[PDB]
Amino acid sequence: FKFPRSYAALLADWPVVVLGMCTLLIVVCALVGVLVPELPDFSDPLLGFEPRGTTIGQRLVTWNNMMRNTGYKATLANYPYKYAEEQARSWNFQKDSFFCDVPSDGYSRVVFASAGGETLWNLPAIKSMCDVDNSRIRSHPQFSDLCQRTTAVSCCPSWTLGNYIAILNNRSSCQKIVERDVSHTLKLLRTCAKHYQNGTLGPDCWCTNVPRKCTKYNAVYQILHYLVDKDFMTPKTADYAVPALKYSMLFSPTEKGESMMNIYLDNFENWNSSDGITTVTGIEFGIKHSLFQDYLLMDTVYPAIAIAIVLLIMCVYTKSMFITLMTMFAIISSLIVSYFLYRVVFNFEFFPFMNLTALIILVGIGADDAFVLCDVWNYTKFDKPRAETSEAVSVTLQHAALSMFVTSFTTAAAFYANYVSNITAIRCFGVYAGTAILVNYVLMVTWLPAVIVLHERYLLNIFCWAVLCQKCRRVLFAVSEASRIFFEKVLPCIVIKFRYLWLIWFLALTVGGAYIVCVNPKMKLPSLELSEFQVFRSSHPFERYDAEFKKLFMFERVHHGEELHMPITVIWGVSPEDSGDPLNPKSKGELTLDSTFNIASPASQAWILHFCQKLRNQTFFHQTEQQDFTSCFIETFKQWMENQDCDEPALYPCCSHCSFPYKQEVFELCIKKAIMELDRSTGYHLNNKTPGPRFDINDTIRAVVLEFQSTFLFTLAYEKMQQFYKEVDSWISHELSSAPEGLSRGWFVSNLEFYDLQDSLSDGTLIAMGLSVAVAFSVMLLTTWNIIISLYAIVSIAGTIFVTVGSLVLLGWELNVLESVTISVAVGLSVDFAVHYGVAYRLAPDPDREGKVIFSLSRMGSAIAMAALTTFVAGAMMMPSTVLAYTQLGTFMMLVMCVSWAFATFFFQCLCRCLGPQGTCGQIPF
Ligand SMILES: CCCCCCCCCCC(CCCCCCCCCC)(CO[C@@H]1O[C@H](CO)[C@@H](O[C@H]2O[C@H](CO)[C@@H](O)[C@H](O)[C@H]2O)[C@H](O)[C@H]1O)CO[C@@H]1O[C@H](CO)[C@@H](O[C@H]2O[C@H](CO)[C@@H](O)[C@H](O)[C@H]2O)[C@H](O)[C@H]1O
Ligand SMILES: CCCCCCCCCCC(CCCCCCCCCC)(CO[C@@H]1O[C@H](CO)[C@@H](O[C@H]2O[C@H](CO)[C@@H](O)[C@H](O)[C@H]2O)[C@H](O)[C@H]1O)CO[C@@H]1O[C@H](CO)[C@@H](O[C@H]2O[C@H](CO)[C@@H](O)[C@H](O)[C@H]2O)[C@H](O)[C@H]1O
Ligand SMILES: CC(C)CCC[C@@H](C)[C@H]1CC[C@H]2[C@@H]3CC=C4C[C@@H](OC(=O)CCC(=O)O)CC[C@]4(C)[C@H]3CC[C@]12C
Ligand SMILES: CC(C)CCC[C@@H](C)[C@H]1CC[C@H]2[C@@H]3CC=C4C[C@@H](OC(=O)CCC(=O)O)CC[C@]4(C)[C@H]3CC[C@]12C
Ligand SMILES: CC(C)CCC[C@@H](C)[C@H]1CC[C@H]2[C@@H]3CC=C4C[C@@H](OC(=O)CCC(=O)O)CC[C@]4(C)[C@H]3CC[C@]12C
Ligand SMILES: CC(C)CCC[C@@H](C)[C@H]1CC[C@H]2[C@@H]3CC=C4C[C@@H](OC(=O)CCC(=O)O)CC[C@]4(C)[C@H]3CC[C@]12C
Ligand SMILES: CC(C)CCC[C@@H](C)[C@H]1CC[C@H]2[C@@H]3CC=C4C[C@@H](OC(=O)CCC(=O)O)CC[C@]4(C)[C@H]3CC[C@]12C
Ligand SMILES: CC(C)CCC[C@@H](C)[C@H]1CC[C@H]2[C@@H]3CC=C4C[C@@H](OC(=O)CCC(=O)O)CC[C@]4(C)[C@H]3CC[C@]12C
Ligand SMILES: CC(C)CCC[C@@H](C)[C@H]1CC[C@H]2[C@@H]3CC=C4C[C@@H](OC(=O)CCC(=O)O)CC[C@]4(C)[C@H]3CC[C@]12C
Ligand SMILES: CC(C)CCC[C@@H](C)[C@H]1CC[C@H]2[C@@H]3CC=C4C[C@@H](OC(=O)CCC(=O)O)CC[C@]4(C)[C@H]3CC[C@]12C
Ligand SMILES: CC(C)CCC[C@@H](C)[C@H]1CC[C@H]2[C@@H]3CC=C4C[C@@H](OC(=O)CCC(=O)O)CC[C@]4(C)[C@H]3CC[C@]12C
Ligand SMILES: CC(C)CCC[C@@H](C)[C@H]1CC[C@H]2[C@@H]3CC=C4C[C@@H](OC(=O)CCC(=O)O)CC[C@]4(C)[C@H]3CC[C@]12C
Ligand SMILES: CC(C)CCC[C@@H](C)[C@H]1CC[C@H]2[C@@H]3CC=C4C[C@@H](OC(=O)CCC(=O)O)CC[C@]4(C)[C@H]3CC[C@]12C
Ligand SMILES: CC(C)CCC[C@@H](C)[C@H]1CC[C@H]2[C@@H]3CC=C4C[C@@H](OC(=O)CCC(=O)O)CC[C@]4(C)[C@H]3CC[C@]12C
Ligand SMILES: CC(C)CCC[C@@H](C)[C@H]1CC[C@H]2[C@@H]3CC=C4C[C@@H](OC(=O)CCC(=O)O)CC[C@]4(C)[C@H]3CC[C@]12C
Ligand SMILES: *[C@@H]1O[C@H](CO)[C@@H](O)[C@H](O)[C@H]1NC(C)=O
Ligand SMILES: *[C@@H]1O[C@H](CO)[C@@H](O)[C@H](O)[C@H]1NC(C)=O
Ligand SMILES: *[C@@H]1O[C@H](CO)[C@@H](O)[C@H](O)[C@H]1NC(C)=O
Ligand code: NA
Ligand code: NA
């Protein structure tokens, strides 16, 4: 029986086989991907934002596994429990003149600013804050179940300036205060602020150095610590009529969390946030990550609107709704098939929210190849108008199929290069987006050639209205002639005549971009900790709370503060290893004990005391004037032993007569006795963080922990924290290199979670961009076979990247997660227009470099323009989004398209016109 004897004949004779086979295996992917995997969860946006394989990361994971597994009959314990049990065997403020408790981070709260720029310390503003709370939080039908309660009659009062003024001036409520009460309260604040600054006022005094008037309910401490900004009542300009209260805070009796969701959505979300007197500038209801999932899915309307505009661009370009809608079916199918491969074939259990942005990327860059194949098909038709379909298909594929691949492969490879990241979310996103891009290419050389054959065979025969069709035809004709005159006549004259203007202008831009990126101001690393990471645009009240207001209120500053010294924690007997799955963020492994460890050896006892006394001589160590008896438990144990009075027979082994390097059996006996003496002799209680030995279920010491304070303070600056880490880790590693066996495998840990993230963002960006640059230059040598065209192309790609990244630096971008991925992807996208032109310069029949540049611009001009335009339009559609990630990706997509199109069309064609090869001058031998 009959069968097609070549691929071009399969497409030409049986296009319905190709579409039927594609449709069936796409339908299988769509079914199995919904039925078999567990569906994605976006309840935590920050989920994979952690380095896994790093030296610091494995130590941090190990220390967390030690802390969870430490406790009564757990894997490790602070106390020798099997020895210990053997010892045991032997409203109206004139009536209810109080608030229900102290305000805290546990309560729902809002930040006010003045609407007219006034000081907030005025009676209209003070009552307007109470009016907003009453009208927007309390009024809600759910509030009465959520509020903390002293009686069934009414909820507790909210912590607000007007209620503190009421209780200080014996008024019944915020609503019944007067200007005399406001000025009286201002005097009390102005005098007693020095007592608060000097640490003499405090939370419980209702303060022996402090006068009674401002002690009256702890009200002056509570106003200054919780309700007012840090510039109000600062020592400078305190003698001023009313000080500038820029911001003030209000606390609701509702506990901060997911119960606030209805109150927010009903009464805060759609509001204009202003009472005309005061504006609500910040909100902290505990719902930021709960709200994130809703907006993350709701904003998928913007990529859907982008699909319709890309359908319009491509319907006018190709002149069919058939080839156009079948191309957009293939674009959306490549996401569905990528998802089946990702969850079912590759077995990835975690789907980051970053993966939803691959719908934006594929809608922008998906049609690029359809514009190329449709052009080449029409050049092929025009060149040989009586060729049979199998010849026309084969010639079209011979001209198009490699350039379509190289532009796709450069962009997929730039995403797969992010699998070299230590950050789990970045690796997962690189795999998902790289796979969709390659699946889309396979459809553009299978599905789209068979669709083009079916159009020509049937639909090309079939295809006010009686004038509207004619009016449509004549305007479509005029648009196409205008497009042809531009790309064949207008644009080549502008490129060639002004070539010396272009060479000077685009070099000046490249030098400017290189100065901004490499000299000043450079791109910065992240400057907020991971819990404060921005998910919404900076306009959103939840983001202004974390970015602006957490640093202006004293209770939010002292939650960590400036005088945190870095701990130096040193651990033995546990292996610093992550045995969990690095691609599953929830898979932390199992705690591993080191079988070679021994503390109780006389050599181990002697060395570890000498290490403690060596470490105290270093410039990184901070001497507290009170001694830490926990820091080096061996010195405290030596001290206890040399105090045992030894006249009692029970003190026979644990005696002051013994010299310090005790025989191992006397160490193992007396350490248990000394630990059990402590919690009876003193009020001191050990916990899973406390330094000391760690016992197993057979009262055997399996680990030891030492801890010391550093002269280094805690900081979010990368270089200061790198200097701390290098100085301490080098000295500890060097000193441990001379430790006896059984102490040789110890390791150092500290508060280094954010420094490990910053370090991983630095390293992974440099590696992924170097891999992306290597692929970009390689594929251009292998596509042009000429070193001079490949060189002018990589110089234009370099100018594109310096102007693109230098522009993002002037826009205030930092090297965060996602921002770091776009830098790698910028290279792989920027390849594409210089490849399309560089192949058309070589293809040119003209002998002279001017004719070859006119040919190149004439033949690739409108396809390059349409690929740039569809990618720009997809990015421009993401600007109404609340999700920060959508708005950042669309910003990048617009910017990189303008810069890469201009450098490929003006700068790279001007290099080819001035000093381009002619007559095989730089041709690589095959
Ligand atoms: C691959 C990823 C798959 C993700 C799967 C999860 C999808 C979750 C969908 C969620 C969602 C978007 C729908 C668009 C999705 C496009 C996907 C494109 C995928 C391409 C591969 C469902 O939108 C639904 O739309 C229905 C339309 O028929 C509508 O039906 C109703 O009318 C029928 C007659 O029309 C009638 O018969 C039926 O009885 C009715 O009920 C529903 O009530 C409505 O809930 C949520 O948005 C809904 O609609 C608005 C949208 O703007 C949204 O507007 C706000 O927010 C926008 C955004 O922040 C912002 O822009 C807007 O300014 C802002 O006002 C609304 O607040 C929200 O309510
Ligand atoms: C596994 C890790 C164990 C961690 C232990 C951590 C707790 C410290 C225990 C050690 C301990 C008692 C001995 C108990 C048994 C020890 C078993 C050891 C087991 C080891 C396996 C040693 O007490 C020290 O004894 C020394 C003699 O031995 C003595 O030395 C002197 O003599 C020599 C010159 O004449 C020469 O030595 C040296 O120059 C001299 O100074 C010191 O003055 C004295 O401070 C502490 O005793 C007391 O503890 C109190 C709180 O309970 C603590 O109260 C304060 O701080 C509280 C807040 O913490 C706070 O609330 C209180 O308001 C506040 O008042 C006292 O200030 C402290 O004194
Ligand atoms: C998920 C669903 C859509 C999967 C099912 C796909 C089917 C609808 C496809 C698969 C193979 C296709 C067939 C493949 C080849 C042909 C031969 C074709 O005719 C010829 O090539 C000319 C024969 C002649 O000499 O007359 C007519 C359509 C037909 C029957 C196709 C009809 C549609 C079929 C059955
Ligand atoms: C954005 C994605 C989800 C689009 C998915 C499209 C599919 C549902 C396919 C299957 C059947 C296709 C239709 C089959 C036949 C025709 C007739 C065809 O008529 C002509 O050929 C008009 C002139 C021309 O377009 O060249 C126009 C497209 C249309 C409606 C096709 C459009 C695309 C359809 C709806
Ligand atoms: C990246 C783009 C191109 C689409 C990728 C494949 C889709 C088939 C996935 C991606 C996100 C998924 C959605 C993300 C979140 C949800 C909520 C989820 O349910 C829960 O989260 C329930 C609450 C909980 O688990 O606690 C299941 C449906 C749905 C819409 C998922 C259905 C399948 C979706 C659309
Ligand atoms: C994971 C998947 C997506 C990888 C897919 C890779 C292929 C699509 C690449 C690899 C090698 C490429 C081929 C290498 C060599 C050629 C010969 C080339 O030149 C000719 O046929 C010579 C005659 C002429 O140019 O007219 C046409 C393109 C083609 C088939 C290339 C098309 C694209 C191919 C098949
Ligand atoms: C999941 C799988 C199916 C992905 C792999 C798809 C391949 C089977 C496709 C991708 C590109 C295609 C090629 C694109 C271009 C050409 C050139 C074309 O012409 C020549 O080879 C002419 C050579 C000469 O003139 O000497 C023949 C078909 C061929 C090899 C195609 C055959 C089928 C290829 C290799
Ligand atoms: C493979 C073909 C299609 C060439 C693709 C271009 C290559 C130059 C690049 C693109 C993506 C790169 C890969 C992206 C990520 C990684 C993970 C990286 O992992 C590790 O070093 C740690 C071990 C691990 O986690 O697997 C090893 C190199 C590798 C495979 C890279 C090797 C070089 C690759 C294949
Ligand atoms: C989203 C809203 C607010 C604005 C959408 C405007 C678009 C519908 C306009 C803007 C630019 C226009 C395009 C400008 C240039 C061209 C190239 C032109 O190319 C050809 O005539 C040559 C085709 C070939 O060589 O075969 C076809 C029309 C097209 C796609 C135009 C179609 C209509 C477009 C996409
Ligand atoms: C800094 C960015 C905008 C660089 C990327 C785009 C520019 C290279 C474009 C944008 C607007 C263009 C200009 C718009 C209009 C004209 C008038 C035009 O006048 C003629 O007489 C043209 C005659 C012809 O060649 O048909 C000469 C080129 C020029 C300056 C264009 C040169 C190329 C420009 C500067
Ligand atoms: C080869 C051509 C094609 C492109 C070359 C561009 C690169 C040299 C640029 C682009 C982005 C730059 C990176 C962007 C941000 C940073 C953070 C920076 O970290 C810091 O300590 C900054 C100060 C801080 O905030 O603490 C280290 C360099 C690095 C990786 C930059 C190094 C230089 C890079 C890789
Ligand atoms: C020609 C095509 C391809 C692009 C058209 C893009 C415009 C329709 C965009 C560009 C900037 C957008 C604006 C940028 C910012 C905002 C603020 C935004 O304010 C919010 O408080 C709600 C959403 C959010 O959280 O950001 C409301 C939409 C709006 C006016 C956007 C409306 C749509 C605009 C005008
Ligand atoms: C979106 C960013 C990434 C840039 C993408 C490339 C654009 C610079 C291209 C896309 C479509 C092009 C347009 C398509 C058609 C025309 C009509 C053309 O009209 C004539 O030359 C008419 C001459 C006559 O009839 O007298 C003038 C240029 C223009 C606007 C083109 C200018 C270059 C455009 C805007
Ligand atoms: C086609 C390319 C190669 C040439 C330039 C095209 C321009 C239309 C674009 C591309 C990048 C844009 C720039 C990207 C970033 C910024 C920073 C932006 O903000 C600031 O400078 C804020 C300064 C501060 O707050 O202190 C002002 C506009 C500017 C210079 C943009 C102006 C218009 C530029 C040069
Ligand atoms: C060794 C490391 C640094 C990797 C180098 C990779 C490429 C940059 C090398 C590999 C082969 C080299 C080519 C081998 C042969 C030639 C032919 C040579 O002469 C001609 O084309 C003109 C001959 C004439 O005079 O007629 C010009 C340099 C070129 C393209 C070489 C330029 C550099 C190439 C592309
Ligand atoms: C209050 O401040 C002064 C000046 O800094 C200081 O000398 C004094 O000791 C402080 N008061 C108390 C009770 O410590
Ligand atoms: C809207 O905002 C203004 C201040 O810009 C405020 O005066 C007004 O009361 C708000 N509400 C309404 C319904 O206008
Ligand atoms: C600590 O430094 C002093 C002063 O140099 C020295 O006498 C002492 O021996 C050092 N102690 C240790 C344990 O290194
Ligand atoms: Na491509
Ligand atoms: Na590319």
Swiss-Prot record:
It comes from the Eukaryota. Disruption phenotype: Death at or soon after 9.5 dpc probably due to abnormal embryonic turning and looping of the heart. Embryos also display defects in development of the forebrain and branchial arches. The chain crosses the membrane at residues 16-36, 296-316, 321-341, 345-365, 400-420, 434-454, 500-520, 769-789, 791-811, 821-841, 864-884, 892-912. Glycans are attached at N198, N378. The keyword Cytoplasm does not apply. The keyword Glycoprotein applies. Changing C612F: In icb; loss of function. Residues 282-454 form the SSD domain. It is found in: Membrane. It is a multi-pass membrane protein. One of its GO terms (cellular component) is membrane. GO terms for molecular function: molecular carrier activity. Keywords: Developmental protein, Glycoprotein, Membrane, Transmembrane, Transmembrane helix. Coiled coil: none annotated. GO terms for biological process: determination of left/right symmetry; diaphragm development; dorsal/ventral pattern formation; embryonic pattern specification; patched ligand maturation; peptide transport. Functions in hedgehog (Hh) signaling. Regulates the release and extracellular accumulation of cholesterol-modified hedgehog proteins and is hence required for effective production of the Hh signal. Synergizes with SCUBE2 to cause an increase in SHH secretion. Belongs to the dispatched family. Interacts with SHH; via the cholesterol anchor of the dually lipid-modified SHH (ShhNp). This is Protein dispatched homolog 1. It comes from Mus musculus. The lineage of its organism: Eukaryota, Metazoa, Chordata, Craniata, Vertebrata. The gene is Disp1. The chain holds residues 174 to 1143 of 1521 of the full protein.
